[PDB]
Design a protein around this nucleic acid. Structure first.
Ligand code: ADP
Ligand code: ADP
Ligand code: ADP
Ligand code: MG
Ligand code: MG
Ligand code: MG
Ligand code: ZN
Lengths: 689, 595, 595
DNA sequence: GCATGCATGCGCATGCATGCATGCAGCATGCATGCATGCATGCGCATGCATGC
């Protein structure tokens, strides 16, 4: 016959029973975990449920090891994820406990409406039962009652979202299984055979659309019969109804006109994102490709441009959208549906103390000598350069912003310029810092210019509104911007960095745009003398091209020269040759700290805000007076990169605050200012050889 | 229903496969590999048209002239043999001489329709690999049954068939609702490409001709734009050329395209496709024997461009560049370069361009460029384009295509700062960074560079220091691993000798050299040794603390260059570790270059 | 494509056939016979619905209520079993109890549509057996190849299918002409009949109801008009009841009919179907044992109509008539009669009608008639009718239906000359001749006759000679082999005894007797013997040359009658030759009848 | 034997199922065209860069 039938090794009743038992039975190594979660959900302190597959695997293995049979719910979900969502939703709805807290005036309108709907359901059921019993024409009575009455379906009474998360490699390895759902893949490797599965993709985000309401069920109200009509929608477009469909209007001769009711509708928060290949995954001589991701519900706003992430999702198809003339059969377009996001570098803003972080941080601080121990751990394969490594660490930590009132503001970030002879690993240090930073961006001269920095006006494909796409500076907001070949930049770009490093903003006034952008970022610049090697026979300011004011506005400026020395050359050569012969550093008395723990400690330190007192103020003013008195004589002899100015005092203050924060103290101390002055002094040591 | 001629052709092709015994064992090997490893191999093999001609001329002509009647029988015979020999359907590909059926997009006319053809050209644009729906599966809630349906279209079969446009089911036969099973459905890939006549053969001043091609399943992503390609397939016509219905329009004709079934990339000079040769056991024995002699480096060095006189050190340097060093990546994520770079400055009749062209011709993957010929985006791939799908992206440039290969630059001094700054990053970090409106990416550009330049005063002057004679940024000169200076001085004996040599010309082989280079670069990766460590340390210290006037400055780049040269010489030696001899050769060559 | 439910049902029916082993050996026997005898047997088997119910009730109800989904699987299972067990498709027939699915054309309503039914009725009109074209074969002259095509219609399967109206091919695909091969094509028979409610069960004074039936292949010529038939089939509906297109007419409904799959003729009184029984080895042993007892004739004669008193000689005569003699045909083409005829004349309360009705009830094929009930054409079948094909033909009458059987005539003396002249030919030549407009034929009417008549004066009178009491033409009397005269004379003892016998009644079995007569009439054919020849010669001479006044004349018909009685008594004895005892018994019986 | 009445066959009117065409009118449908949309194109201006003086 037409539409034959086929037999598969899948039974849904057994799986549903197993789901119910799992939801009501699981215990982690207190009552059931998921039952407590449901109690919170009913009490209205939660919105999302996360189902982990490691729990399911543990449940299955526990059932097996003691003999009783169990099905491979893990494999079933992995292969046909999209179908189990409804099974889980129904299983949960069959078990949701009652609310233990009354509904008050400080609750959500959504919850109010849901409660009203449930009470109304109970009212019709009771009324129908009473009416039927009155006739004198209990399971049969109940059954006829459900059969002869209309209700609000469960989906219009649910209040929570449900998501899955993949199987951990550790758990699969311990249980002797192969975690397919948690093997990272590139957009290159995702082919058609993977459709309908739960898979993990490793990539870098490039574009994210704004959050907008996506409709799932439209609601209309009929004034004639007082009914509510619900129309499902699962397409990119739909058609509104005109005439009633309720039973009364259907039977009657005069039908009422439907109207639209936004509040009763069922909306979803929807975003679309574009993910791109990583460099190391692209084959030789090819261009990276992209992929489309959809985010629905409470998982929105979890992705921002420039993030390197692992996204778990269900791979689903979509209707074809190319030209008709090139269509050959039933071609389809693909996308990923998001379920779980894992960042490769945890943002500072999301910091929160906890036993696991506490033990590691206390271990590190107990080990002692935190300052030097961290400083030596930045790019440990580069020899020497301890002072610049310390300065870079202080730049990473940052200072303290100050809100002085009356609308004014004082920056709290540190700006560093390295200026050196060729072949001293400036680019290596730049790249290492950009990698260690959680929002570090990297740039090189003519590669990016104009709208490459700042932002440009474009039109969103998803929505029909105009938007601004940011450049490197906006992408590096609340982070580090590393610039190579600083002196080769164009005048417009130089002015852009000028204004950013002045007041953390960028003003644009051009055809079709009149606005200001926020660029709360730190600057780490690299530069090379104007004649290649430094010429001691010429003044420092004539040895460089950038404007003296631009040099001055930097908090820290280092000069790096290559003076041959038969002693230190031996040490450097031994270091480099050891680094090549192995893949590790040579020192054995020092153990470097990994970037994860470094980020942990820096994030913790950023929570502090030390303050300044009178003794330190007196010391600072005396030091500033002495330094300002001295610098004038040097500048007169044309042997200084710049005269001392109040920006120097502000830089000293910021460095002292950063050192205090690193020490993890609310109180600043004289030794911090001592170290800051030591650094700012040694900044120009090589100029006096 | 069964057809007598169809069965007869099946039997005849079965006899062919029986008389020839390579394809049976090939199929057995494919099945054995798949069974053992469960990666999976496709169910396809290749046949020799020459063998077919020798066996049965009638069947040969039948396949060549009427594939629609002769291929499906052979495919069925192959499938039957595979299913019989084993403890999806299989497919066929063709190699051999096509005689008059080897054409080009310009010489492909309507008289070749429905006949198997082989076209050569350059890929101009590919399409996005999309899945195609074949079989759909559904589940019934009210009954607990699984239903399915099948689909097909015009391009999946050679013989015309009566359309059967089955609809997508949403209800059961009884009226119940249906649920879709994406994981239990079946999808197949599909791509479309365009091929154009090569620019080395197309008429000049005349617009080019192009032809479409459709690829399916396991032939879906075997090429990229800009490749030289040879495609063997069936040239077919589809649809009705406006005949059906009135269709008053008469201008349009019949749609045509190729149901491609074999695709081959071809190597060419100044192209992104690398050359690769198959190595035989005789080749391996010969190369391994040759490696054991003591003057192998000298022999290989002299083998290069024997038509030119002298320049032994430059020949050795070119060989070292070809072999290359080794690059290191640390767990932290740091990258350490392993390529080599060469610059030559000399008098204007010293065969600089000749050596440049020789390296272009012999290198497996090389791209040639001149000073002002390519500028701006043409070098860094900084151009942006977009299709009708709305997405913008990049298309590769000189150095980007040159990844893992060689770039020859002629008239080097003629460049500008806008692109010298750009090439700084390529020569040191081996990456390219782009940031335009809506694009922020990074492209790997791991390539080596050979360049030649002229002195400022026409002829090299010995009365001035090298700075005035070269006049190039010191930072740039630092990035080049080796710099050579060559001057022609008149001398009766040398002039005599070059005269006899040139007159001789005017009245080891390269292929074996290429095989040697391929094996050496693919198989062996040596490691450092304490002896070499000490030798390099001593030599670098001496150079840094010597007062002699040099042509180039000294940095840590010199130490890294010494290490790279030692490793490359070890690679030439085919040893697993660098040695004192290799270190000394590297030091001696560097000293000769500098002094 | 394959269907899971179809496969499950096939496997279940396979299990049924495995558990029940009779059908397997039946199929093996059919194949054995068809192989050995090359007449060919068809591929059809009968299944028991009772066994199906006992095995699987759900499957039983499935077949009963939805045959369209359950039968084809069973047919496929049977075909598979046959093709597996052997060293066309096969078909099924159903017997057993149909419960509420046994109906009649009056009680057959729309609620039974698509359900397996069993109807009973009388065949009213059969149709002409025509061949149906299935597969056509053609030959191409220009190319020397044979093509073919297949055809189908709506009535060849239970399940609906998408129409595929292929056309008759006259040309090749290339344009060549084609020549048909009538000898290599394939044709199948086809017939349509109509069944009506029985006349003994339909309400009196009401018009009857009828239903059509379609038969195909080997069920094509199993019945004739006027027969009692039970047909088991599938009640089905075809076409669209004017729904498609406008078709403004609403009076007509859906066409319906039965795709019959089993046909059974049934025996009834005064009907053209002969009754037959199946003889078991127990039956044969009992009959053969009984054969050896000396008083077998006496016991058999007494067994008939034990409710009546006396008439022993008449019972003997009726038994002799039932057994019958032998008819002879010579190489010349002459025919010699072998039947017997009986006439009874008696007083009006002598159970004549009772004996006559007993013979009607017991004889395998008997037809009953009254004096004036049937007249003219009704006896000789001389009626002429025609269909819409335009041809005229004959439809059989009483004696024509009575071929090889018995005719009971009651109130014989009320007939007329016009039909007594007709019956003369039937009694003597055993043939009927008709010569009407466009009809000149001759029908075989080999039947025996038993008749009863009343004396002229109400009661037989002994004071007058037999002629005045009988008053029938001497020619007619000569044709009756035996004539009996029976009178009731009052007598105290006889009246007493008949009284007790009748009162006893008012307060060997027949089936075994019927089996006995069937076996005797089918198996034994005796021959004449010189002893009987001499005895009959002497008896005939004496009778012809005696002076006693007889009740009937004497001719050579009397000698032939002696022969027939002797042969029939030998048949009763189951001896292969007549004997002196049989001759003497025949002579004694005839002498008693005449005197 | 002789006269009548009933059945029976012959002849004369007529209605009635099949099967076909023809003029006609109705109804789905292709076809003219009316349009917004998104895209690529060239088309000058501002200007950073290289060159000559
Ligand atoms: N102090 C050092 N220790 C180890 N390697 C170094 C050091 N200084 C320079 N190098 C090497 O020299 C190269 C300098 O390249 P780069 O990082 O671009 O610096 P620059 O821009 O000054 O040339 C690097 O590849 C690095 O490995
Ligand atoms: N060392 C040499 N031995 C033989 N021939 C040479 C040598 N140097 C130059 N020539 C000849 O002189 C010509 C130089 O051409 P070209 O390579 O264009 O000059 P250049 O490279 O110096 O610009 C070549 O055709 C080559 O045959
Ligand atoms: N010899 C007999 N033995 C028993 N019953 C007889 C006998 N003769 C007549 N009868 C009874 O008398 C009735 C005669 O009915 P019927 O056969 O119509 O009379 P007839 O045959 O003389 O015309 C029957 O019902 C039968 O039972
Ligand atoms: Mg650098
Ligand atoms: Mg040249
Ligand atoms: Mg009677
Ligand atoms: Zn309504």
């Amino acid at each position: 016959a037409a539409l034959p039938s086929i037999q598969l090794p899948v039974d849904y009743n057994n799986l549903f029973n197993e789901i119910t038992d799992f939801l009501v039975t699981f215990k982690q190594d207190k009552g059931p975990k998921y039952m407590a979660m449901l109690q919170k959900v009913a009490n209205r302190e939660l919105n999302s449920v996360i189902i982990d597959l490691d729990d399911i695997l543990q449940y299955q293995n526990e059932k097996f090891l003691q003999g009783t049979q169990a099905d491979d719910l893990v494999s079933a979900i992995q292969q046909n994820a999209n179908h189990f969502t409804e099974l889980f939703c129904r299983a949960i709805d069959n078990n949701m406990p009652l609310p233990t807290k009354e509904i008050d005036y400080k609750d959500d309108v959504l919850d109010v409406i849901l409660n009203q709907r449930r009470l109304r359901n109970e009212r019709m059921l009771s009324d129908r039962t009473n009416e039927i019993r009155s006739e004198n024409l209990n399971d049969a009575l109940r059954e006829v009652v459900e059969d002869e009455t209309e209700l609000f379906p469960p989906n219009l009474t649910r209040r929570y979202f449900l998501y899955f998360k993949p199987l951990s490699q550790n758990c699969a390895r311990r249980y002797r299984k192969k975690a397919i759902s948690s093997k990272p893949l590139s957009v290159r490797q995702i082919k058609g055979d993977f459709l309908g599965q739960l898979i993990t993709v490793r990539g870098i985000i490039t574009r994210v659309s704004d959050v907008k309401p996506a409709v799932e069920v439209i609601a209309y109200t009929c004034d004639q019969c007082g009914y509510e009509v619900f129309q499902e929608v699962n397409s990119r477009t739909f058609t509104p109804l005109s005439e009633c469909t309720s039973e009364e209007c259907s039977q009657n001769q005069t039908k009422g006109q439907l109207f639209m009711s936004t509040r009763a509708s069922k909306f979803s928060a929807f975003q679309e994102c574009k993910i791109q290949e990583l460099s190391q995954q692209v084959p030789v001589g090819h261009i990276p490709r992209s992929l489309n991701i959809h985010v629905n519900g409470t998982l929105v706003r979890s992705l921002s441009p420039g993030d390197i992430v692992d996204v778990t999702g269900i791979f689903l198809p979509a209707p074809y959208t190319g030209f008709k003339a090139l269509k050959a059969g039933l071609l389809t377009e693909t996308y990923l549906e998001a379920q779980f996001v894992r960042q490769h570098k945890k943002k500072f803003a999301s910091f929160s103390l906890t036993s696991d972080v506490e033990e590691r941080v206390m271990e590190l601080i107990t080990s002692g000598d935190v300052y030097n121990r961290l400083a030596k751990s930045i790019a440990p394969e580069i020899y020497g350069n301890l002072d610049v490594k310390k300065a870079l660490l202080l730049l990473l930590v940052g200072g303290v912003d100050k809100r002085v009132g009356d609308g004014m503001k004082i920056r709290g970030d540190i700006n560093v310029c390295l200026m050196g002879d060729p072949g001293v690993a400036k680019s290596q240090l730049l790249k290492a810092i950009c990698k260690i930073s959680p929002r570090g961006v990297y740039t090189t001269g003519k590669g990016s210019s104009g709208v490459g920095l700042t932002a440009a006006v474009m039109k969103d494909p998803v929505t029909d509104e105009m938007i601004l796409e940011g450049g490197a500076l906006v992408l590096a907001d609340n982070g580090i911007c590393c610039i190579d070949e600083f002196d080769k930049m164009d005048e417009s770009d130089r002015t852009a960095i000028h204004e950013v490093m002045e007041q953390q903003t960028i003003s644009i006034s051009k055809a079709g745009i009149n606005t200001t952008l926020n660029a709360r970022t730190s600057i780490l610049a690299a530069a090379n003398p104007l004649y290649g090697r430094y010429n001691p026979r010429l003044s420092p300011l004539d040895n460089i091209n950038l404007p003296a004011a631009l040099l001055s506005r930097f908090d820290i400026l280092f000069l790096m020269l290559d003076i041959p020395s038969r002693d230190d050359d031996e040490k450097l050569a031994e270091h480099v040759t050891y680094v090549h012969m192995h893949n590790k550093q040579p020192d054995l008395d020092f153990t470097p700290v990994e970037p994860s723990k470094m980020r942990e400690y820096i994030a913790y330190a950023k929570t502090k805000r030390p303050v300044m007192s009178e003794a330190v103020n007196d010391y600072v003013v005396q030091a500033y007076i002495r330094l300002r008195q001295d610098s004038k004589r040097e500048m007169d002899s044309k042997f200084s990169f710049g005269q001392a100015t109040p920006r120097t005092l502000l830089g000293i203050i910021r460095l002292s605050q950063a050192l205090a924060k690193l020490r993890l103290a609310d109180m600043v101390d004289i030794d911090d200012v001592e170290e800051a002055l030591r650094l700012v002094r040694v900044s120009k040591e090589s100029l006096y050889q | 229903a069964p057809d007598a001629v169809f069965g007869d052709r099946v039997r005849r092709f079965q006899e062919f496969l029986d008389t020839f015994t390579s394809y049976r064992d090939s199929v057995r090997s494919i099945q054995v590999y798949n069974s053992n490893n469960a990666n999976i191999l496709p169910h396809r093999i290749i046949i020799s048209l020459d063998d077919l001609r020798e066996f049965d001329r009638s069947f040969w002509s039948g396949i060549l002239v009427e594939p629609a009647y002769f291929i499906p029988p052979a495919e069925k015979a192959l499938t039957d043999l595979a299913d019989s020999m084993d403890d999806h359907p299989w497919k066929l590909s063709f190699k051999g001489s096509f005689g008059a059926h080897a054409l080009s997009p310009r010489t492909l006319t309507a008289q070749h329709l429905n006949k198997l053809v082989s076209v050569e050209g350059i890929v101009t644009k590919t399409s996005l690999v999309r899945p195609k729906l074949i079989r759909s599966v559904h589940y019934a809630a009210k009954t607990g049954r699984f239903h399915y349906r099948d689909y097909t279209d015009a391009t999946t079969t050679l013989t015309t068939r009566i359309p059967t446009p089955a609809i997508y089911p949403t209800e059961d036969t009884e009226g119940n609702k249906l649920t879709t099973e994406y994981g239990y459905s079946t999808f197949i890939d599909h791509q479309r490409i365009t091929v154009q006549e090569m620019p080395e053969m197309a008429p000049a001043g005349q617009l080019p001709r192009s032809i479409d091609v459709i690829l399916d399943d396991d032939l879906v992503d075997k090429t990229k734009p800009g490749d030289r390609v040879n495609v063997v397939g069936v040239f077919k016509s589809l649809g009705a050329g406006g005949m059906n219905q009135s269709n008053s329009n008469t201008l349009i004709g019949f749609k045509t395209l190729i149901l491609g079934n074999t695709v081959y990339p071809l190597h060419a000079r100044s192209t992104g496709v690398a050359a690769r040769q198959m190595l035989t056991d005789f080749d391996i024995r010969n190369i391994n024997k040759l490696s054991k002699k003591k003057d192998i480096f000298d022999i290989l060095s002299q083998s290069l461009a024997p038509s030119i006189y002298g320049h032994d050190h430059i020949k050795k340097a070119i060989l070292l560049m070809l072999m290359g060093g080794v690059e290191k990546n640390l767990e932290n994520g740091s990258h350490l370069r392993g390529d080599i770079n060469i610059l030559m400055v000399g008098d204007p009749s010293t065969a600089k361009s000749q050596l440049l062209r020789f390296v272009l011709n012999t290198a497996s993957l090389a791209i040639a460029t001149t000073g002002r010929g390519s500028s701006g985006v043409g070098l860094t791939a900084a151009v942006t384009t977009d299709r009708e799908t709305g997405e913008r992206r990049l298309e590769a440039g000189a150095m980007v295509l040159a990844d893992r290969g060689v770039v020859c630059i002629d008239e080097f001094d003629k460049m500008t700062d806008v692109d010298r700054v750009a090439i700084h990053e390529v020569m040191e970090q081996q990456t390219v960074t782009i940031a335009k409106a809506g694009i922020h990416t990074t492209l790997n550009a791991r390539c080596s560079v050979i360049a030649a330049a002229n002195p400022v005063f026409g002829q090299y002057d010995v009365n001035r220091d090298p700075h005035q004679n070269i006049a190039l940024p010191d930072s740039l000169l630092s990035r080049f691993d080796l710099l050579f200076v060559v001057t022609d001085d008149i001398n009766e004996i040398r002039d005599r000798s070059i005269s006899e040599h040139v007159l001789r010309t005017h009245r080891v082989t390269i292929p074996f050299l290429r095989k040697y280079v391929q094996y050496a670069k693919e198989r062996v990766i040596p490691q450092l040794t304490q002896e070499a460590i000490n030798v390099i340390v001593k030599n670098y210290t001496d150079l840094r603390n010597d007062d002699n006037t040099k042509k180039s400055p000294i940095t840590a780049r010199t130490l890294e260059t010494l290490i790279r040269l030692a490793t490359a010489h070890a690679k030439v030696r085919l040893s697993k570790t660098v040695n004192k001899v290799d270190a000394k050769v590297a030091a001696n060559l560097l000293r000769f270059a500098l002094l």
